[PDB]
Structure 1
Amino acid sequence: ARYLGPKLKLSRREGTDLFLKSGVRAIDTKCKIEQAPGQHGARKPRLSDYGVQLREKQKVRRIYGVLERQFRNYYKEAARLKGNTGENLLALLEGRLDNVVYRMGFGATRAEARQLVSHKAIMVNGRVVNIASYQVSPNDVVSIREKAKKQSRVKAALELAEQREKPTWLEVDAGKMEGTFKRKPERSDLSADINEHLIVELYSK
């Protein structure tokens, strides 16, 4: 149910830094992003229109760490909802608890954030939630359990989070090491290099 292989091959196939590593090191000093993985990775082929739609879906799936069955269910929920389907899909992926923990900065990676929420370390409104796909509603409180507030991982993750851009729909507090989910982020609040219309196109054939 999880990908346990090498993580930089995914960013090398997508050709974009998927933030699959902490970033304490420059990414070009770790892997050749401009080269695809494998023996024939130097030859960059002419992808088709089906190819670029599939590559966009695998890119957003490998950023958010979601397998195909759960990602398909997210697409059905986004098209079932009202408004923009792709924007609703991005809001459902950013509503996930591991993504909120990583975006709040309690995890340096979303995979570490998944291990923190899987090991009974994150309390939502004072209740321990052990599911990484727990959808966080607006105006909620996400905190770290008192059993793990003295860990080096969480403070090192907060240092890397203060080294990066702060989200506008979240409040954090490293003193009590808790935080508040304020609202669903709009399309302008997240990254712009994700063409979400390609995902909706892909799931229409």
Structure 2
Amino acid sequence: ARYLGPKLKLSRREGTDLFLKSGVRAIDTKCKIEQAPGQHGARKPRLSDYGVQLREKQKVRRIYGVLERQFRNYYKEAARLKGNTGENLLALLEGRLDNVVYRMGFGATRAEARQLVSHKAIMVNGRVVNIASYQVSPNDVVSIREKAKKQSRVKAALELAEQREKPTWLEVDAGKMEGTFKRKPERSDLSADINEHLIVELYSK
């Protein structure tokens, strides 16, 4: 129910940095981005309309580490909610604990976030949770366990948090390794390289 194979094959297939690696090194030096994985990764064949829609969907799923069944439930939830389906779907994907832990920087990537959340090392409002896809309500407080406070990996990710651009809606206190969820993003803070419109008509065939 997870991905265990090579990480940068995913970043290669959609041809862009997917943040799967910690970013301590340059992704270009670590791997050749402009080539697709496999023996034919030299060739770039003409991709059809269905192909580009599928690549967009698979790109979002591999950024957030979510499988297809989970992701289809998010889309149905997004379509049921009032508003607009595209940014509603993105909003749920943000409220997952993996993303919020990762974005606040206690984990270098979602995989550290996954270990941290799933190894009972994350508390929300002081309650221990180990479910990766637990939605985060606004005004909820996520903090590190006192046992987990003395581990090297968590403090290591705090520096990389600064190394990248800080999220405006998450307020962090690395002095005691805590963070606050003020409210959800509005799709204006998120990266524009994700075309959420293609997602709607992929699942609405």
TM-score (norm 1): 0.99
Q: Could you tell me which residue of structure 2 aligns to residue 116 of structure 1? A: 116
Instruction: Report SS of the residue matched to 1:187.
Output: coil
| CA deviations over 1:9-58 (Å, ceiling 9, x no partner) | 00000101000000000000111111000000110010000000000000
C-alpha RMSD over aligned residues: 0.5
Shift of 1:151: 1.1
C-alpha distance in structure 2 between counterparts of 1:35 and 1:180, whole Å? 40
Write the distance in 2 (CA, Å) between the matches of 1:184 and 1:161.
19
Secondary structure of 1:188's aligned partner:
coil
**Partners of 1:54 and 1:106 in 2: how far apart?**
32
Shift, 1:111, TM fit: 1.0
Q: Confirm or deny that 1:163 pairs with 2:191.
A: no
Residues matched between the structures, number = 205
Please report the TM-score for the alignment, with normalisation by the length of structure 2.
0.99
Q: Secondary structure at the match of 1:189?
A: coil
Cα separation, 2, equivalents of 1:96 and 1:59: 17
Distance 1:150 1:84 in 2: 43
Could you tell me how far 1:77 is from its partner in structure 2? Answer: 0.3
Looking at structure 2, the residues matched to 122 and 192 of structure 1 have their Cα atoms a distance apart, in angstroms, of: 30
Asked if 1:99 is matched to 2:96, the reply is no
Structure 2, gaps ≥5 residues long: none
Structure 1 gaps, min length 5: none
CA shift for structure 1 position 134: 0.5
Q: Secondary structure at the match of 1:161?
A: helix
Distance of 1:178 and 1:112 partners within structure 2? 16
Q: Give how far 1:169 is off.
A: 0.7
Deviation at 1:150, TM superposition (A): 1.1
Offset of residue 176 of structure 1: 1.1
C-alpha separation in 1, matches of 2:177 and 2:21 = 22
Instruction: State the 1:112 CA deviation.
Output: 1.2
Q: Secondary structure at the match of 2:87?
A: helix
Identity %: 100
Instruction: Tell me, in whole angstroms, the C-alpha distance in 1 between the residues paired with 2:190 and 2:170.
Output: 12
